[model samples]
Target chain A: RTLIVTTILEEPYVMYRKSDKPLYGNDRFEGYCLDLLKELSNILGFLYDVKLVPDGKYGAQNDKGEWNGMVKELIDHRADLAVAPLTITYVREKVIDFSKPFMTLGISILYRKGTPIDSADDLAKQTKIEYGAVRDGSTMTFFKKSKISTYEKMWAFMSSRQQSALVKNSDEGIQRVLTTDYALLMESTSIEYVTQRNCNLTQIGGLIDSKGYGVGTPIGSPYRDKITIAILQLQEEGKLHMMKEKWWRGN
Target chain B: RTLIVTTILEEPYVMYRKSDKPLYGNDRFEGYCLDLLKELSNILGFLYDVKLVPDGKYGAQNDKGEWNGMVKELIDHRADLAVAPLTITYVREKVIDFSKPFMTLGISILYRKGTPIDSADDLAKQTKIEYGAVRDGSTMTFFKKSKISTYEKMWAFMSSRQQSALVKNSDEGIQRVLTTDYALLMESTSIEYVTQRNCNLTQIGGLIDSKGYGVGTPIGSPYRDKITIAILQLQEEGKLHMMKEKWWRGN
Candidate 1:
């Protein structure tokens, strides 16, 4: 039986593999996570049909505690596994199971080059330059729940002007940063990818917090342990590093 | 019902409190993990009795497919929770369950100041300076299972002369490095703790591999998820950073 795998079309993780002809099925996609999915299949001996998350979101919780995006798909058993840059946060882990981290990253500021900002404190103190993360995303949730004063102040600012400040997705935020005087608080790895290709964009400061991206499966799913084993094996074999290098640097 | 907590006496994690008079029960211990255990109890609303692992080892698998140390205790149902510097490795995850990582670190070379060696490759190439990790530890397992050429070469040398090269524990390794012409391959965090107190000692290079320390539980235990939630809460509130500062840098 082929498992329905849910994922998001994020750079360096999943992307449309450019071809002269039309591509179908899993062949249509290739990136760091595609390589990862391939390895997991080989290790676990399972067939997977890659499907992008219908919502175009990584998954987030609402004020009423409802979930959307890939997470809900797993909870509904519509997807057997979510093999994307899905972060293993505290809230998500309660509903679905995650294998050990395949990649470690942190939340940081994605700003344009030659910015007056040097740290998160700078961004938090200044009201002139607007900053926010993806709407209904983990990064947004982090600030929304933070107890630190600076983060609380920043979150208050973002929460107050949710419509004018916060973007719906990373690309929109990236584009906004390119065109407007704004800083995007997002994953450090994603920021690194952007900074590498776009000479004008840069990371503003050190990571504010650390977390990791993991493979997700429905709670009590047998594949959870199997996938964790496969990930650890790949990590030990150094294939994870190779895949990152091939996608992030090997142009 | 009170849970039985198993831990190891590792510096900055678990240590005997120095007092004018003899201390008794849990009050005798105080360190990062003790503080962590205290926090977990407060969150979960449960009582626990801390017991050190019978064997001094951090739980590594033997050649007979058997496990020893705290891992075995969890596997045997002798303990309900394992809260210490126990690493979340591929092999360990197969038998017992782990929460999301509480602390992240990597393997690196621990050497004295002013050495000709700058990398693991340097240690591998030259026979003049002896290099090895603690026998039957995660550091040993990493080198033992490593597929990289340089690591494989180093493992072969360590394996060939295990009696002379590999020490019994990190303290022995640290002592050996301090007195003899040798470099100890160990966790970066432990190396940091060592280099801080000992002026002559220092970490030689960047980490060889990245990993994390996690709380361990038996398969299908209720505490696993609860502990994970509490850890995320601690991380979000910056309490994890504060705790680290209190132990690592604070008096």
Candidate 2:
């Protein structure tokens, strides 16, 4: 039996082959998270197939309970697991059960070296503090909710298109932060990966008080326990730490 | 002339010396917080006599443009300053500018020893895990918005009242948790005091939110900046840390 796993082409974590039209196979998608999912499937005795969808489409599907996001795919019963750096929040936990976090990280500010975006609070103080995240990405939603609407009103009056300019994928977001005075909002893991490859940007004063990503399963599903056990096992075998070290070495 | 400062009476932080009747002028509210306020007043060259009043009444008076809360009194031209373990939250932030936190703590859960309550999810699993919070305490609102609302609902269904149990203070809430299966939700700092006093209860997890007790001041009040700077100095001098140790050291 084959387990269909939903995923997105998030670079450094889950990237696509440069060749167009790749099949739903292992080589088409690769990253620390993918490797972890592969091992999880092996231990659980499941045959897996990965399907990549557009980032924006994924969020919409997940919200509709159709498994639009890889994580939500498991929720909607379209897939068995979502092995992405999907950040867990209180709202999502209400619908799904996440394993103890395999990787722990929070939102961070990435800017070209020596930018004054020192802390989340500092970022709020700057009128020029431009931030970018992938279109329809959860991190961008978090930025809008926590930083813009509630924390500060930097983008409170800006048009949606203007807001869109501040958000893009890792490659584009990093480039924007480097070339302009704006900073990029991303997970700590992603920032670490990108900084290694680009070497032109730096993350300042990591986000405090924001929750981070965890491997997750559908609520009330028996797979929850098994996934949690596997995560603990990975930690005990030091593979969890090794994955962080290997993936974050250059970034 | 003695300045009347409205306050509340509680143990460890504020105690009503039974021997002294008409508690307002007596030295009943003496603790690290009170002493720090006194030190701050002295540094800023101000003086006032502390008086006891229902906690929110001061803010109420301030609402009428009367300085009711000690801080409001300072701004409304009633008394001078308000001091207590009064916590600062976003809602309060709108009306008053608090001095950077005088003390930092998070809301935490105290449950009967060996209770299955671990993470919020575990507590969320039970239909019977009704939580009791102080009637007017901020933690009650927090519990209402917790990720485990359904579990809270379960507890409500088991009881005649659907609302969370509202007790008089932290002590009563802890008592409820201990004497029965109900979990007590209170501030971590207050729970620390409770745990030191008795070991029958324990903190289940880290605080749910990063919070701090701050000396509040009315928006645009002149004393705000000086008080803010003074508190920062106190923090740097380790005076605040010492105060925490002095009060929170042992049972």
Candidate 3:
């Protein structure tokens, strides 16, 4: 009777509500995803339980082609919806369905501050400032298999270093940028939150590639099209943009 | 076996390629959508036969809930793909599925240069300058059922006049703006081409509502996801934007 929503905890999207005492259930969380889930529930008339993804990853396949994070949750039918900042990419679309992008972004560099290193090309040409993307993420895979010479060289450099060079998540990458002479390739939307909260951090140059974050659903789920309609309606009504602005400003 | 693509003839997206002699088949067309279809076919490995939609309209439902235009083509199995500047709207999404938007835009005003009128509000307040959208199109439907007070009032003025106020298509609306004291509501992407060539005409204010144009398919079509992925890949590779610019510049 109720929808089970799987998501990840990320700033401005999914974050825990702070309290002096322990919080439980849905009240334990609040952010843009929380606000969106509320709006969708009211429009579609459904009850939902928001559960954090067990693996704390956005979803990627390994060499074996096995999926992890929220994607696997949808694949296994453990969740009815995967509502998070999950990027809609080609590999993901083959196995799962997505609504129209709730938000659009691209991969970009999250750096301590901008200097001579102005772009991905700048980082590619130099060895002084180390650069890499979140391991096994769409960002990493993009560079890992990119035919573009600059990206290909960067991937070769980062791929060789393994765990020490490639980060596990945006959070880890954020820290790496602050402490070391490093730049982490990240989704622009997430970088918007990180740089805003941490003034020392800033996004360098423009977007490297374009994509969107969409609500994920199991393949062949009847709820997919209905959810797409609801999202388009919310977008046309300007609710989706309003939510983004509100959350980005520490709502 | 070849897939059938249903589309409307529109500038920048689909147009008759000029020839010394009358060309037949797909050879006659050349534009953004034509280029897009070619790329999609190459990626998806399918041969396609492009046909103009039997109905000239984009897609809208009648009072009896009968869908028309490219949407109907897919619903009735007359076409495998609706490759046009078809907007991904809520109502249409319920009947025919859409890939991730190949391009994004918003509804805007196409006017004969700016004078006293600066925004939709100026047009809403004045009755001297007539304003309306393409008849039986998404723009008209938005005003018809809008909850916004300004839009509702404009709809009242346009609806009372009926056929005289609303043009049949963007082309008809473009001519009305040039020869008469009328402003047309059109998608920004279409407005881009119109204003670019016709220096006398101009766009007024910013976009009224945000939406996108996507590849349409019948509900439950297997090709939908594949097409969405292919479109996304094209977008990431910068081909989609390149095609838009190339066509808008009269390629």
Can you tell me the CAPRI class of model 1?
acceptable
What would the TM-scores of all predictions be?
0.79, 0.45, 0.71
Sort every candidate by DockQ, greatest first: 1, 3, 2
lDDT of 2 at A234: 66
Residue-level lDDT of model 3, residues A1-251, one tens digit each, is 88999999987788988775677788899999999989889888999999999999888889989999999999999999999988887788878888888777778989876476668888887888888888887789778767667788899989887767899888898899999988999888888878778988888876677777889999988877777878888887768867876877532
Answer with 2 or 3, whichever has the higher lDDT.
3
Error of 1 at A29 (Å): 1.0
**Candidate number with the higher TM-score (2 or 3):** 3
Per-residue lDDT tens digits for candidate 1, residues B1-251, read 88888999988999999886777778889999999999989988999999999997678778998999999999999999999998787888889999878988889999988766768888898888899999987789888888878889999999987898999999999999999998999998888787777889888866788788999999888888789889988887788877876787621
> Which stretch of 10 consecutive residues in model 3 chain B shows the poorest summed lDDT?
B242-251
Winner by DockQ between candidate 3 and candidate 2: 3
Task: Score residue B107 of candidate 3 by CA lDDT.
Answer: 80
Q: What fraction of the true Cα-Cα contacts (under 8 Å, chains A to B) does candidate 1 also have?
A: 0.54
Which pairs of residues collide in candidate 1? none
Error of 3 at A210 (Å): 3.2
lDDT of 2 by residue, B15-95 (tens): 655565555553556677676877787777766677655444435424454444555554554544456676654445445
Each model's DockQ score: 0.41, 0.02, 0.30
List per-prediction Cα lDDT, in the order shown: 0.87, 0.61, 0.85
- DockQ, prediction 3: 0.30
lDDT of 3: 0.85
